Structure formats: structure tokens, C-alpha cells
């Protein structure tokens, strides 16, 4: 029997709202776990997203001047790093962003506006996320081009906290590649394989797309360059992943979904896609066979 899958757009409101851990109960070892100031904050971001229903706007959020401050600095030190560090997709896709979307040193972009940005580019959408879903409900967003984002910033004590994915590793990690066509066909079709998939399956096509959509590298041109967002959000991982310090396989979906998935170190191995469109077909094939 297939299980329940999403079958137009509004129907990732029952998805969305299935939350197996809230943003606002933080890890044990997160850096804001005694902070009571910033417990708050994040369980406002998480009723934000919580009555969220497709169709609304996404709410604008003030950021305060410290949160802002956080973003600052995680932006300019990236930014030094991506043009001998980032793949020619996501260098062309950044200025766009300033341009449009108020990318800036001093502002946190808001997540409607780069919403709207998306689906004029590639049809890709936005939903805020009060937390963490299971891999069939988040990849399932991406059937319809909607990515589940989340809308808080990291705790400013310590602003490279890497482990669970704030409003910067969406926006300077994810949104410049959902910006570009042959990347949003090649996550969509993640999307698409794991509706009604088996578990074992959904659990094999959230594997390649870890150690693709967030921790991918391509050649380009001869050379090594990054597209996973994990990596254009960290930047310490950024820079370890195109050094001499690191593993490196080829994108093969048979041997990628079989790599544990680390959470708290770097990865112990990267997997490099020849392009976007050949992931794809790599992809293509295999989901046939799952
Ligand atoms: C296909 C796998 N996958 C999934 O099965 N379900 C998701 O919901 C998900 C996801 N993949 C991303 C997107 C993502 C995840 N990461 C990064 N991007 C950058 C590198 C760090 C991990 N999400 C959304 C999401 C939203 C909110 C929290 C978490 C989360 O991982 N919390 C930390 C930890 N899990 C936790 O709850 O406490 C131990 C993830
Ligand atoms: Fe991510």
C-alpha cells in the first residue's frame, strides 16, 4: 500500500505541520539552551511557521540589531570565500539577489521576498518550518518546488554554530542554487521519486541528497568547486572541502546512499557531481531500480 503522499501544493499543509521536534526545544549542547531570551524568539518563529497555510504571504519578522549583527558576519566572511570557492551557478545567482532581494552586510533578506524572486526564476517557492519533519515530508516540498526553510537566526554567542540549519544557511546556502533551472529540475526530481516511495527508498533519495543539494561538490572546467549548501553556509567546511585533507568520491547513487550521514564534524567524505544535469540522469537511473 502507498502511503499518503502530497498531491497539489496546499496539501504540504498537512506535511508541514507534522513537526517530530520543534525548533524551539533546542539541543542539549545548543549554544542558546539556558539563554530564556533567546527560547522565546525562536518559539516565535516557530508559530510563525506553525499557522502558516499555503497561500499566505510569508510573515516579514524585525530581526534585531544582534541578529542582524550575526548575519553581518557570517556574510562578509563567506563572501570572501565564494568566488574561489562556489560553482559558477551560485556566483551568478548571488548579485541577483543583493540586487532584488536586499542580500546586504547590515539586512536579513526576508523570506517572501526571496520567495517571489524564486518563482519568478524557476517557479521555486518558500515555506517557513516550525522544525524538523520527517525526510518523506521535507522532501516532499520539493515535488512542487516548495523548500521547507527555516526563519530564525543562529544565537549570536556563538555565530558558527553549524549543526542545525538557521535562516543564513538557507539564504546564502540554498536560495542562489533554487534560483537556477537545471539545479531546481534536479531537486524537484528528488521530490517527485520519493512520493509514495517506499521507507527504504525515501531514506536512500535523502541520502543523495545530502551529499548533493547540501554537501555536494562539481567539476567545472577541471575544477573542484562547491554547490552543497551545508558547505556555502560553513565556513570553516568550505574551506576543508576543496583542501588536500579530503576524501572525495565520484556521485555514484548506488555507493552515495550507502554514506552515513554526519551531523556534529565535517564530512568524512564528499561526492562530486560531473554537473547538475548529470546528476539528474545518475539520479534518473537509479530511482528506476528503487
Ligand atoms: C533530508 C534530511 N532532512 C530530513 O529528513 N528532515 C528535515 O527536516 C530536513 C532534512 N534536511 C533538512 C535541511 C538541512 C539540514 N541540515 C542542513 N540543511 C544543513 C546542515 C545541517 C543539517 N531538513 C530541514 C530541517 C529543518 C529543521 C531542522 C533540521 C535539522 O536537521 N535539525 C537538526 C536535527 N535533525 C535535530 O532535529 O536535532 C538533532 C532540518
Ligand atoms: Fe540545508
Redesign the pocket.
Known sequence: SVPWFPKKISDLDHCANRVL?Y?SEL?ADHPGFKDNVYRKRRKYFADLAMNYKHGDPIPKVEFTEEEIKTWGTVFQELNKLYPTHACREYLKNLPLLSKYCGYREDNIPQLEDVSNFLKERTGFSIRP?A?????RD??SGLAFRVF?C?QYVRHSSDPFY????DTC?ELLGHVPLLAEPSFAQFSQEIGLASLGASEEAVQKL?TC??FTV?FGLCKQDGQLRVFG??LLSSISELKHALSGHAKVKPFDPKITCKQECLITTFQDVYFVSESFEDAKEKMREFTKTI
Open positions: 521536534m525548533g539541543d518550518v522544525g524538523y519533519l520527517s525526510p521535507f522532501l521547507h527555516t553549524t549543526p542545525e540549519p544557511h535523502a541528497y545530502f547540501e549548501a551545508g
